[PDB]
Design a protein around this ligand. Structure first.
Ligand SMILES: CCCCCCCCCCCCCCCCCC(=O)OC[C@H](COP(=O)([O-])OCC(O)COP(=O)([O-])OC[C@@H](COC(=O)CCCCCCCCCCCCCCCCC)OC(=O)CCCCCCCCCCCCCCCCC)OC(=O)CCCCCCCCCCCCCCCCC
Ligand SMILES: CCCCCCCCCCCCCCCCCC(=O)OC[C@H](COP(=O)(O)OCCN)OC(=O)CCCCCCCCCCCCCCCCC
Ligand SMILES: CCCCCCCCCCCCCCCCCC(=O)OC[C@H](COP(=O)(O)OCCN)OC(=O)CCCCCCCCCCCCCCCCC
Ligand SMILES: CCCCCCCCCCCCCCCCCC(=O)OC[C@H](COP(=O)(O)OCCN)OC(=O)CCCCCCCCCCCCCCCCC
Ligand SMILES: CCCCCCCCCCCCCCCCCC(=O)OC[C@H](COP(=O)(O)OCCN)OC(=O)CCCCCCCCCCCCCCCCC
Ligand SMILES: CCCCCCCCCCCCCCCCCC(=O)OC[C@H](COP(=O)(O)OCCN)OC(=O)CCCCCCCCCCCCCCCCC
Ligand SMILES: CCCCCCCCCCC[C@H](O)CC(=O)SCCNC(=O)CCNC(=O)[C@H](O)C(C)(C)COP(=O)(O)O
Lengths: 38, 606, 458, 100, 170, 178, 55
């Protein structure tokens, strides 16, 4: 009844430093939003 | 004589008049059943005027009313032929229609949608007559497909019942297999000789004309319920009984026989197809007749008889005797229409009992229909000096005198004895037996709408063969010279057919051998063509679409190969090219490699 | 032809400037008249086709369509007034404008002299369509469907771009008039055998061929009714119009380079027709019906006999009108039912008496009942196909039997049988729903009276 | 749970506005959005359009060619010329490759 | 309609020779049709034609005059060839309604002569081949993109044959 | 059609339901009546004997050989009544059984006529909503104490309460709409 | 007269397009007027007091 707007899960994929994460490629986690590292 | 032309155009306009009245708001105010019944009545009188003309002198009128498309070389136009086949049939059809609409008003009384039912019946008549009088075959196609669709709408009148829906889908499927044949014939006549007009197709006499006429034979077998795809006419009885009488009984089925008579001039040239239909007509005659012997549904027995008589009609066309085949079509229409409305009377008068087993002694309870039933039964059995006799024995002795398959000749004659048998089965079980109907009795056939039409057709059934045979133009040069056994064979076989059946019915009354199963089954469950070819084909034809063509080649194989593979090829290629350490040394060394290769690219191509 | 176009553009200003409450009537009423101006192009009292001006032309093949493209915008805007009536008053004016641009672009594409004008406008129509399908698409999968609709057309499109720039260098102008009156005869090399495939493949893709038609079932499934009408009625036929005007050049190769497609299409016609026989989603079945009845067309635009082309032009205009009618009534059931499933909603005639008459006439148009342009069309393609090889009737003969079966099954299990016990009660029919239908069929009845107008160039 | 709205029901627009024509919820817009759609839709497109299309004269010359044939067939038959000669472009005009 | 483009044979009718006392049910009816169906209509029709003859107007035929054909036409000159592909596409139709008439004239000659069509109607079928053998020899192999250049070639492919075969016979 | 199907069938109901199919498939073979009534009281004899077999094993061995005797001695076209399955008039008048929740979308003009009809209809709809609570609660308060549940629904058990889940056994479209 | 509030301001938008359209389509003719009357099939000689064959 509602054109399906994307839920949280559809959104989740676009997170992560690489869209198609492979082996030893998921190790990468997104860069800090502030552009500053700990 | 414009009186002739105008009359042929006028019948169509008068019959179309009920159709558009329902289109406008006017029908609510007047009575549609009474109005429609009157106009068909007037159409029959209008049809009579050309019929007398044709008798005076044999003139054939081709009427090109409207042009539809030039289409370059093949011009297309709306043409009605008025040859002996067309006007004789037009008069017989409307008389039957005038009978049925009056019957329809009584039969469907209390139906909440009587007006729509009458509306479709006349639309059926309009398509049927267009099919009858069609010069170019494109119009013949409009009629051929047109009766098919309205039969679908009218067999399944009571849409709610799935049984009616199943039969309607059956009828469309069998007709469409037939349509493939007509399309093939139409396409062959759209190429080779070039025009769909009969007046030119007949110039293809000295050509091959086998590819095409085999197509029309295929079209006839589907429309006329020959041994191949014979089952939908039995199934068609799921329709209202009046619908069963005018379309299942006369106009719709004879359409296949009518098409071949139209194209006979071509048929006489090819000997191969003539025996082909003689052979299949013969097989359907007995196959259908034997099935009818054990059927216990009154409407079903009459329907099988409709198929068996047309099987005889197919046989005469197969023996290249077109004029007599048409003569049986007209006589067949009067009596079969009677028997079906006769049973319409019995079924409606009883509490909708459609089984001979619970119906008995109608002769004393309802003499009016019983009298009509036996008149019709004897006409069906070719009683001497009744309408069947004038045309039917001509066909029988034709067989006994021509050069023919021995197997075809023997089966057609015993088929005639079988017609007497099942005819005997109906009157013994339905009329001459102790009553077995439910105990409360409420029978009324006094309604004018029942009697009148039944009375009117009965007059036709008694006198029509006399009138039609003398009036028609001398044709076919019959062979009246025969050894007496062959001259009287139709009469005797019909007599002993009843005699033997009467003997068997008596054996039933005794207290013995409750169960009797001598291949009775093959006979009782339609020769098993329905049980086996209706469960395998629809099962193996749908399983292949869902399981194989749709899901296997569609979905997975055609989505894994082109659309998905290209998805993967890239996805994987990006994964290797973009998985980079991020360290500068690695990256830089790649710059080293590049310099090296480019140094070479120049070097080797110096 | 700038009255069929400029007045169209001005529709956009009207959809935006007009009052939120009155936006719908101004747009629908005006484009009905825009269709009336479109009818003037039909006045061809001579063989010489009408070259309005350098860039804009209309010949017998384009004229029957430009009128259909102008005709459906009114209807599209009438079929989407319900869904899209729950929007924010600026989402509507976007949808209305999107629909308006489609026919502006489609009118020009069908009325374009330069083949690359066709390409630029040809591939532009994807932008408006993808927005209509993806932005307003009800199902979770329209993002996917949109991708399929963009890539299959796009990968086909860039080869045509290279081919048309290629012929411009080989001949010196992409003007359809000249290209016709000039000697461009390919030389049956291995390369030309590729050129031919480059030009035809992009057109063969949006005209679903058996090999690449998966985009159309997926696209129409989640597409809103207006998008599904546009894809079936005008969008797919863009591929056919292209094949007619592009094969004027590449004249020699198609004699022998067509066999692959012809066989792909005729076998495809049977399998696509058959899977319609057991598909639970009604919109799914109409879409595969569309693939099969369009597979006949690619098998007539390749046999290349006068009658084929004439059959093709008849069927394309006719099937366009019929398909929409089927997609439009499918939507009316979908909105009250709220599910695309064919098995639910049984017995509707019992509750929606007339819509069922429209359903019956639409199905009879779907199958080939004879006093219909739909049959004339198939009868003609059938004839030529028979001429190509008498055996073709077998395959074009299994399709006719199957086409009868699925067309009536849609009527038998949707509009007959016992009523569904108690789905959300089905509110009666709106007059808009019924007109949107009447507007589809009344033209189908009128065109069948005088088939000459949609008869093609041949 | 992630905050989101509860499913919106679809109104029975036929409960109020029992004369609903299917175009818009408030009644006057509906009436004026069918009084202009049946009119511009049917009354002056299907009628005036069919009138104009019916009167397009001799469309694509096929009304002219059934006369030109008649005078050509009239002229060719009476003067004894073949009704459709078998070569159209005269043989004299053609300069066939001489050697081959 | 020109009695000469759509011919029609003179009529020969056997005279009435009744040999029965009974009254013919046809003659009576006609006597009515002629009064209650024809006279009424006849009256209206005339009144039509006098309404026409008051402001009688005329419409002509648009004679298209000849113009240089392909064989006279330069190669690549899109102007001349355009004017000359039309002159042919035009005669592709005039040469097609001619064939429409032979399709028709025949059809009538087999309705007017039934049971004799095999014979009496052979004045036209001889012509339906004299005209079909020609239409087949200038317009048939061609695609749907029929153009004068291609008829020019369909012919000239065969003018070799009426020159190779002839030379061959030697 | 009214009462609910039992889970498993007993020995009896299987035997006593053959006595029906059998005798009713003996009246297709014995088209007459005196022959039938004769050949049938002879049937009961067959069932009458072997009535008191106490040896279940045996009993289920007479039953298993009865229903095979029957399957091979059955009539292909028996006498099945109209309004019964398979035979005609079964779903004939179902095209005219509209489901009664459709008179709720009628135009105020249509319902204007037929006035008292809707005055009584609105009473019944008040009855339906006035008890859904007491009903469902009943349906639940009387719920099974075990997973063993049969489709049988409870009666009323209190005055004023309407025997439950009743809106569609009552308010059923009439059989012959005509 | 241009009654506002979407009274004639808007209703005259599309119609005006038509006029402008017709103004251009009759202007395109003016440009493509070579071979005005110089075509072979239709090269009549100017009738007295007539400026040009087709305008
Ligand atoms: C050669 C020519 C072809 C011959 C062969 C043709 C194919 C074979 C026949 C196919 C018929 C298909 C079909 O089932 O249609 C029935 C269908 C009616 O079915 P129904 O179940 O009674 O409809 C029930 C509904 O509740 C509606 O019924 P209602 O209860 O509302 O009753 C009021 C009545 C009210 O009727 C109206 O719809 C009025 C519409 C008026 C439009 C024009 C107004 C005036 C314009 C002036 C300018 O409604 C109807 O009964 C008719 C419904 C029509 C639906 C829309 C029809 C649009 C025009 C169809 C024209 C068909 C071709 C021309 C004939 O519509 C037709 O009657 C079509 C007739 C087609 C005749 C074709 C030619 C016959 C031979 C010549
Ligand atoms: C789902 C059902 C679909 C039904 C589709 C039915 C399609 C039937 C037609 C398909 C085949 C078309 C063949 C066209 C001609 C082929 C080439 C040809 O010219 O053959 C000539 C031949 C007549 O020549 P003849 O001297 O008889 O020798 C034949 C044997 N060598 O001509 C022939 O061989 C004629 C062969 C029969 C043609 C008519 C067939 C009608 C149906 C036959 C039975 C179909 C199943 C029942
Ligand atoms: C030696 C020979 C000596 C002379 C013997 C001559 C006997 C010739 C036969 C005479 C009887 C003919 C007859 O009664 O016909 C019955 C008629 C059907 O006859 P039929 O010719 O089949 O017409 C149907 C279409 N062919 O069926 C009927 O007409 C029944 C009555 C119909 C009444 C119609 C009423 C019309 C007015 C209706 C409004 C009141
Ligand atoms: C003459 C000598 C030789 C004799 C033998 C020759 C062969 C004769 C038979 C050839 C094939 C005929 C057509 C086969 C299908 C027939 C129609 C049919 O089966 O439909 C009936 C089916 C069930 O209905 P029924 O069993 O009648 O019971 C109703 C009352 N309970 O109702 C249904 O709806 C079934 C499902 C229908 C929809 C799908 C059907 C398949 C559609 C595509 C395949 C069509 C058949 C194959 C292609 C054409 C072959 C000719
Ligand atoms: C992947 C999808 C594309 C696969 C191939 C598509 C068809 C070939 C390329 C596009 C069409 C085309 O124009 O190719 C023809 C070209 C030669 O052009 P041609 O006009 O024959 O010039 C001959 C001069 N003597 O010949 C070529 O262009 C060959 C192109 C080879 C690479 C094709 C694309 C690969 C993409 C990865
Ligand atoms: C244009 C390209 C495509 C565009 C599609 C969308 C267009 C929508 C907007 C425009 C709508 C109107 C324009 C299209 C309809 C044109 C109607 C028309 O052209 O009628 C012509 C007809 C005169 O007949 P004519 O062909 O000139 O004479 C032949 C001489 N050899 O004049 C008439 O006779 C008018 C008669 C009116 C009523 C006719 C009803 C006849 C019905 C016959 C068939 C009935 C059964 C149909 C079955 C169909 C099944 C699906
Ligand atoms: C016409 C078709 C002919 C087919 C006839 C058929 O094949 C022949 C035939 O039925 S062979 C009958 C023998 N069938 C039995 O012998 C079962 C006996 N079953 C018991 O005795 C039970 O154990 C019980 C004690 C509960 C009976 O009690 P109850 O009174 O039936 O409830």
């Amino acid at each position: 009844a509602r054109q399906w707007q994307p839920d949280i899960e559809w959104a989740e994929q676009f997170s992560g430093a690489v869209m198609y994460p492979s082996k030893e490629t998921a190790h990468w986690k997104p860069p800090p939003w502030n552009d500053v590292d700990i | 004589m414009n009186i002739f032309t105008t009359s042929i155009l006028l019948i169509f306009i008068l019959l179309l008049s009920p159709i558009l009245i329902s289109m406008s708001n006017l029908i609510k105010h007047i009575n549609f059943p009474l109005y429609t019944t009157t106009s068909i009545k007037f159409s029959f009188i209008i049809s009579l005027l050309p019929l007398l003309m044709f008798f005076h002198n044999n003139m054939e009128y081709m009427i090109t009313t409207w042009h539809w498309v030039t289409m370059n070389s093949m011009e297309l136009k709306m043409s009605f032929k008025t040859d002996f086949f067309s006007i004789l049939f037009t008069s017989v059809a409307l008389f039957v229609t005038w009978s049925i609409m009056q019957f329809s008003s009584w039969y469907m009384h209390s139906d909440p949608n009587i007006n729509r039912f009458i509306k479709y019946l006349t639309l059926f008549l309009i398509t049927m007559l267009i099919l009858t009088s069609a010069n170019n075959m494109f119009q013949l196609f409009i009629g051929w497909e047109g009766v098919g669709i309205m039969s679908f709408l009218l067999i399944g009148w009571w849409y709610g019942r799935t049984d009616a829906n199943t039969a309607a889908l059956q009828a469309i499927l069998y007709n469409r297999i037939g349509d493939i044949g007509f399309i093939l014939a139409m396409v062959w006549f759209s190429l080779n000789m070039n025009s769909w007009e009969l007046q030119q197709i007949m110039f293809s006499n000295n050509n091959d004309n086998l590819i095409p006429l085999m197509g029309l034979l295929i079209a006839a077998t589907g429309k006329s319920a020959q041994f191949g795809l014979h089952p939908w006419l039995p199934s068609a009885m799921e329709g209202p009984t009046p619908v069963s009488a005018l379309l299942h009984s006369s106009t719709m089925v004879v359409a296949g026989i009518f098409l071949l008579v139209r194209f006979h001039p071509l048929t006489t040239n090819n000997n191969f197809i003539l025996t082909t239909m003689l052979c299949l007509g013969a097989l359907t005659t007995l196959f259908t007749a034997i099935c009818a012997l054990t059927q216990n549904d009154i409407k079903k027995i009459i329907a099988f008889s409709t198929s068996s008589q047309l099987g005889l009609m197919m046989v005469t066309l197969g023996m290249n005797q077109p004029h007599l085949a048409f003569l049986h079509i007209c006589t067949h229409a009067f009596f079969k229409a009677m028997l079906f409305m006769c049973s319409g009377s019995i079924i409606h008068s009883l509490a909708d009992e459609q089984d001979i087993r619970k119906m008995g002694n109608i002769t004393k309870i309802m003499p009016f229909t019983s009298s009509c039933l036996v008149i019709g039964s004897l006409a069906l059995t070719g009683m001497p000096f009744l309408t069947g006799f004038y045309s039917k024995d001509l066909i029988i002795e034709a067989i006994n005198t021509c050069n023919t398959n021995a197997w075809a000749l023997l089966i057609t004659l015993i088929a005639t004895s079988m017609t007497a048998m099942y005819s005997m089965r109906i009157i013994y079980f339905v009329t001459m037996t102790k009553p077995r109907f439910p105990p409360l009795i409420s029978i009324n056939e006094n309604d004018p709408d029942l009697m009148n039409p039944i009375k009117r057709l009965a007059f036709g059934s008694i006198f029509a063969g006399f009138v039609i045979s003398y009036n028609i133009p001398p044709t076919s040069i019959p062979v009246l010279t025969m050894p007496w056994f062959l001259k009287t064979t139709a009469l005797i076989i019909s007599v002993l057919g009843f005699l033997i059946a009467l003997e068997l019915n008596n054996l039933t009354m005794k207290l013995s051998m409750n169960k009797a199963n001598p291949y009775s089954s093959f006979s009782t469950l339609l020769g098993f063509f329905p049980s086996i070819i209706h469960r395998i084909t629809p099962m193996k034809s749908l399983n292949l679409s869902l399981k194989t063509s749709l899901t296997l080649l569609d979905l997975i194989w055609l989505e894994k190969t082109i659309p998905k593979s290209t998805s993967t090829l890239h996805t994987n290629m990006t994964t290797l090219t973009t998985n980079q350490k991020g360290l500068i040394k690695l990256y830089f060394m790649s710059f080293l490699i590049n310099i090296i290769l480019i140094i070479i690219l120049y070097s080797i191509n110096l | 032809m700038l009255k069929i176009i400029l007045p169209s553009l001005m529709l956009l200003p009207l959809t935006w400037l007009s009052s939120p409450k009155k936006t719908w009537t101004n747009v629908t009423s005006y484009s009905f008249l825009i269709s009336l101006t479109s009818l003037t192009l039909l006045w061809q009292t001579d063989e010489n086709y009408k070259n309005f001006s350098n860039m804009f032309s209309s010949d017998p093949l384009s004229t029957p369509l430009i009128i259909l493209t102008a005709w459906l915008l009114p209807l599209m805007l009438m079929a989407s007034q319900n869904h899209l009536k729950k929007d924010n008053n600026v989402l509507q004016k976007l949808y209305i404008s999107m629909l308006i641009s489609l026919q502006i672009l489609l009118i020009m594409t069908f009325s374009a002299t330069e083949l690359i004008m066709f390409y630029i406008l040809f591939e532009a129509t994807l932008i408006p369509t993808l927005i209509i399908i993806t932005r307003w698409g009800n199902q979770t999968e329209r993002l996917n469907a949109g991708i399929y609709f963009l890539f299959y057309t796009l990968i086909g499109s860039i080869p045509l771009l290279i081919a048309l720039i290629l012929i411009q260098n080989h001949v010196g102008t992409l003007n359809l008039m000249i290209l016709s009156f000039t000697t461009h005869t390919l030389d049956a090399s291995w390369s030309n055998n590729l050129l031919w495939l480059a030009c035809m493949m992009a057109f063969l893709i949006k005209m679903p061929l058996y090999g690449v038609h998966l985009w159309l079932p997926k696209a129409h499934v989640e597409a809103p009714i207006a998008g599904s009408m546009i894809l079936a009625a005008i969008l797919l036929k863009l591929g056919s119009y292209g094949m007619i005007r592009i094969s004027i050049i590449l004249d020699p190769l198609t004699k022998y380079m067509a066999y692959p497609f012809i066989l792909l299409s005729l076998w495809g016609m049977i399998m696509t027709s058959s899977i319609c026989l057991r598909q639970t989603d009604l919109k799914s079945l109409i879409a595969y019906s569309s693939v099969s009845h369009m597979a006949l067309v690619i098998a007539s635009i390749m046999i290349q006999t006068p009658w084929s082309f004439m059959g093709a032009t008849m069927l394309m205009i006719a099937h366009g009108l019929t398909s929409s009618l089927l997609f439009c009534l499918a939507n009316s059931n979908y909105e009250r039912i709220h599910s695309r499933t064919m098995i639910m909603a049984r017995g509707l005639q019992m509750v929606f008496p007339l819509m069922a008459t429209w359903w019956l006439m639409a199905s009879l148009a779907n199958l080939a009942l004879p006093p219909s342009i739909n049959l004339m069309g198939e009868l003609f393609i059938t004839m030529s196909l028979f001429s190509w090889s008498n055996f073709t009737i077998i395959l074009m003969g299994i399709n006719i039997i199957i086409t009868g079966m699925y067309s009536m099954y849609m009527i038998i299990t949707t509009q007959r049988g016992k009523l569904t016990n108690h789905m959300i009660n089905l509110q009666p029919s709106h007059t808009r729903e019924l007109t949107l239908m009447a507007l589809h069929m009344i033209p189908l009845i009128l065109l069948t009276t005088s088939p000459k107008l949609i008869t093609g160039l041949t | 749970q992630w905050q989101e709205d509860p499913e919106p029901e679809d109104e029975n627009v036929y409960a109020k506005n029992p004369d609903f024509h299917g175009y818009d919820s408030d009644p006057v817009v509906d009436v004026w959005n069918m009084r202009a759609v049946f009119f511009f839709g049917f009354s002056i497109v299907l009628v005036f359009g069919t009138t104009f299309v019916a009167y397009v004269p001799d469309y694509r010359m096929q009304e002219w060619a059934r006369r030109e044939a008649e005078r050509l067939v009239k002229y060719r038959e009476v003067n004894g010329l073949p009704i459709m000669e078998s070569n159209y472009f005269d043989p004299s005009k053609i300069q066939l490759p001489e050697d081959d | 309609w020109d009695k000469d483009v759509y011919p029609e044979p003179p009529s020969r009718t056997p005279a009435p020779s009744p040999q029965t006392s009974l009254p013919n049910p046809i003659t009576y009816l006609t006597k009515a049709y002629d009064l209650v169906v024809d006279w009424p209509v006849t009256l209206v029709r005339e009144f039509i034609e006098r309404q026409h003859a008051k402001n009688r107007t005329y419409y002509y035929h648009r004679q298209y005059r000849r113009v240089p054909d392909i064989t006279e036409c330069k190669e690549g000159d899109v102007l001349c060839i355009y004017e000359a592909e039309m002159q042919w596409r035009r005669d592709f139709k005039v040469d097609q309604e001619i064939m429409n008439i032979i399709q028709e004239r025949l059809k009538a000659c087999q309705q007017r002569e039934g049971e004799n069509y095999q014979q009496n109607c052979a004045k036209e079928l001889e012509q339906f081949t004299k005209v079909t053998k020609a239409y087949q020899d200038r317009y048939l192999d061609l695609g749907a993109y029929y153009s004068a250049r291609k008829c020019l070639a369909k012919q000239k492919q065969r003018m070799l044959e009426e020159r190779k075969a002839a030379r061959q016979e030697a | 059609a009214f009462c609910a199907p039992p889970a498993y069938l007993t020995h009896q109901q299987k035997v006593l339901r053959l006595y029906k199919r059998a005798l009713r498939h003996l009246e297709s073979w014995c088209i007459h009546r005196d022959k039938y009534r004769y050949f049938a009281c002879l049937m009961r004899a067959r069932f009458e004997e072997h009535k008191n077999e106490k040896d279940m094993m045996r009993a289920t061995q007479l039953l298993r050989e009865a229903e095979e005797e029957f399957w091979q001695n059955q009539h292909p076209q028996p006498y099945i009544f109209p309004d019964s399955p398979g035979g005609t008039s079964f779903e004939r008048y179902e095209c005219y059984k509209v489901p009664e929740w459709c008179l709720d979308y009628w135009h105020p003009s249509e319902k204007a006529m037929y006035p008292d009809y809707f005055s009584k209809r609105e009473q019944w709809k008040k009855l339906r909503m006035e008890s859904w609570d007491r009903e469902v609660k009943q349906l639940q308060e009387e719920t099974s104490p075990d997973g063993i549940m049969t489709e049988a629904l409870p009666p009323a058990r209190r005055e004023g309460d309407l025997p439950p889940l009743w809106w569609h056994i009552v308010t059923r479209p009439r059989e012959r709409p005509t | 007269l241009f009654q506002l509030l979407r009274e004639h301001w808007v209703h005259i938008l599309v119609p005006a397009g038509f006029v402008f359209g017709c103004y251009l389509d009759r202007k395109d003719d003016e440009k493509l007027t070579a071979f005005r009357n110089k075509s072979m099939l239709f090269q009549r000689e100017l009738r007295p007091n007539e400026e040009v064959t087709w305008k």
